[PDB]
């Protein structure tokens, strides 16, 4: 079922890659390059996040999410995939690079204070 859904997804990428527009072929080449390098998709991350949000919401929010995404072609995702995604530890280097890129010298001071708290908890 997931491979059928992936064929239904990649039919759109094949249609955009053979359309003839510059932006469609550029986005299709970006999708192909992201798939060939082994990089996971942002759609799967959004699906896991909205599945955990649907799991931990109340009945009004659960009915709102189920009525919003009833016609959207979502893949049938087990709870074990969402638990595998959620229980993974986060990378320190990627968050460090993101806080050095988003914030400047204030990011350097904040990371210095974070390493100060780290080596304080080491003692």
């Amino acid at each position: 079922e997931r491979l059928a859904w992936l064929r239904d997804v990649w039919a759109q990428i094949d249609a955009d890659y053979r359309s003839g527009d510059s932006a469609r072929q550029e986005t299709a080449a970006q999708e192909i390059s992201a798939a060939l390098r082994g990089e996971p998709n942002d759609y799967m991350r959004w699906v896991y996040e909205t599945k955990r949000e649907l799991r931990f919401a109340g009945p009004v929010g659960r009915r709102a999410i189920q009525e919003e995404l009833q016609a959207a072609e979502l893949p049938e995702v087990l709870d074990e995939e969402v638990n595998r995604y959620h229980d993974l530890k986060l990378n320190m280097m990627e968050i460090e690079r993101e806080v050095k890129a988003k914030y400047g010298v204030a990011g350097q001071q904040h990371w210095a204070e974070l390493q100060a708290a780290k080596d304080e908890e080491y003692i």
């Binding site: 986060l90 968050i95 890129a101 988003k102 914030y103 400047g104 010298v105 904040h110 974070l114 708290a117």
Partner: protein, 133 residues
């Protein structure tokens, strides 16, 4: 200003304030033992006074609120939407993604969001939503 909204070491006088408020909120929610008190009559009254005190604060409007008294397809679409649609429920929720309602509060208000492995003071869990772009 306009130039202070991008990244790259510009706007340091308010970027360091936002990164200090993200740090002080994490240390107060985790490492401050005196916040875990059941509410009593003094907390229920004075926060209700604080509930009304913020609602009495009115925002100072600018000069935009003052007023006095073959067409193109783009110009006629704005005039037809203002007269036929006075209340649009679809557009007010598009603003909710931009304003990002409960930005720094829903990270601590959600159920089962914070893992137990990142429940230390050195842990970097309030910076996962930071996107460089």
């Amino acid at each position: 200003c306009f130039s202070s909204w991008n990244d790259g070491s510009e706007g340091y006088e308010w970027k360091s304030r936002a990164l200090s408020e993200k740090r002080s909120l994490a240390l107060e929610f985790l490492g401050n033992v005196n916040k875990r008190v059941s509410i009593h009559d003094a907390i229920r009254l004075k926060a209700d006074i604080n509930k009304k005190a913020i609602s009495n604060v009115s925002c100072p409007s600018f000069f935009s609120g003052i007023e006095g008294a073959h067409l193109s397809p783009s110009d006629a679409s704005l005039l037809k939407e203002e007269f036929l649609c006075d209340y649009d429920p679809s557009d007010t929720k598009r603003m909710a993604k931009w304003v990002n309602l409960r930005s720094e509060t829903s990270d601590y208000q959600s159920y089962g969001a914070i893992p137990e492995g990142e429940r230390s003071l050195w842990s970097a869990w309030y910076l996962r939503n930071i996107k460089a772009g």
